C-alpha cells in the first residue's frame, strides 16, 4: 500500500523551466526541442514490491521497474545510460540518477489531486504537473 496514492494514469498539464533543466543535464538542441514539446502520459503501477513507471508520448515511450532502495540501470529518454536509485522519503518518491560523474534528482509527490514532479540539476529546477487522465 506504499505507493497507493501514486498508482494510476496521469497526463501532463504544465511544465516550467524544462528546457533549462535539459540544458543543464546536457541534452542537445534537437532532442530538447522535440522532448520539450511532448505531453506524456505517466502510468504508475505496483505489483508486490515492484513499482513500474511508464511514460508514453509522441517522442519516446519509456518504462522502468524497480524495488525501492535497489539500484538499477536506466536508459533515459534522451539516451543517457544512468544508474538510478529510487526511495520513498516522507511520502515522496526520490529518484537519483548518476552518470559520467554527474547527478540529477527527480522528486514525485502527491499534492491535492495532482502529481507534481520536481527535477533538479545543480541549481536548476523544473516543475512538471500531472493530473489524472
Ligand X SMILES: O=C(Nc1ccc(F)c(Cl)c1)[C@H]1CCCC[C@H]1C(=O)O
Annotated binding site for a fatty acid: 128-130
Smallest separation (angstroms) from ligand X to the CB of 42: 5
Region from 1-9, 44-52, 58-66, 79-87 binding ligand X, contact rule CB under 6 A: 58-66
CA-to-CA dists, residue 106 to 30, 53, 86, angstroms: 23, 13, 9
- Cα-Cα end-to-end distance for the chain: 21
Q: Residues with Cβ < 8 Å from 79, sequence gap 6 or more?
A: 31
Of 38 and 96, nearer to ligand X (C-beta) is 38
Of 80 and 88, nearer to ligand X (C-beta) is 80
Backbone angles phi, psi at 19, to 5 degrees: -60, -45
Give the distance from CA 97 to its chain's centroid. Answer: 10
Is residue 66 part of the contact set for ligand X (CB under 6 A)? no
Is residue 119 part of the contact set for ligand X (CB under 6 A)? yes
Is residue 38 part of the contact set for ligand X (CB under 6 A)? yes
Give the distance from CA 41 to its chain's centroid. Answer: 11
Is residue 55 part of the contact set for ligand X (CB under 6 A)? yes
* Residue ranges binding ligand X (CB under 6 A): 35, 38, 40, 42, 55, 57, 59-60, 62, 77, 106, 117, 119, 128
Amino acid at each position: 500500500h506504499m505507493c497507493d496514492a501514486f498508482v494510476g494514469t496521469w497526463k501532463l498539464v504544465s511544465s516550467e523551466n524544462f528546457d533549462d533543466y535539459m540544458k543543464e543535464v546536457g541534452v542537445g538542441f534537437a532532442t530538447r526541442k522535440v522532448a520539450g514539446m511532448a505531453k506524456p502520459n505517466m502510468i504508475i503501477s505496483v505489483n508486490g514490491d515492484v513499482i513500474t513507471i511508464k511514460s508514453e508520448s509522441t517522442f519516446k515511450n519509456t518504462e522502468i521497474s524497480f524495488i525501492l532502495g535497489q539500484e538499477f540501470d536506466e536508459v533515459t529518454a534522451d539516451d543517457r545510460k544512468v544508474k538510478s536509485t529510487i526511495t520513498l522519503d516522507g511520502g515522496v518518491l526520490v529518484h537519483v540518477q548518476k552518470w559520467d560523474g554527474k547527478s540529477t534528482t527527480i522528486k514525485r509527490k502527491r499534492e491535492d489531486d495532482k502529481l507534481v514532479v520536481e527535477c533538479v540539476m545543480k541549481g536548476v529546477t523544473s516543475t512538471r504537473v500531472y493530473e489524472r487522465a
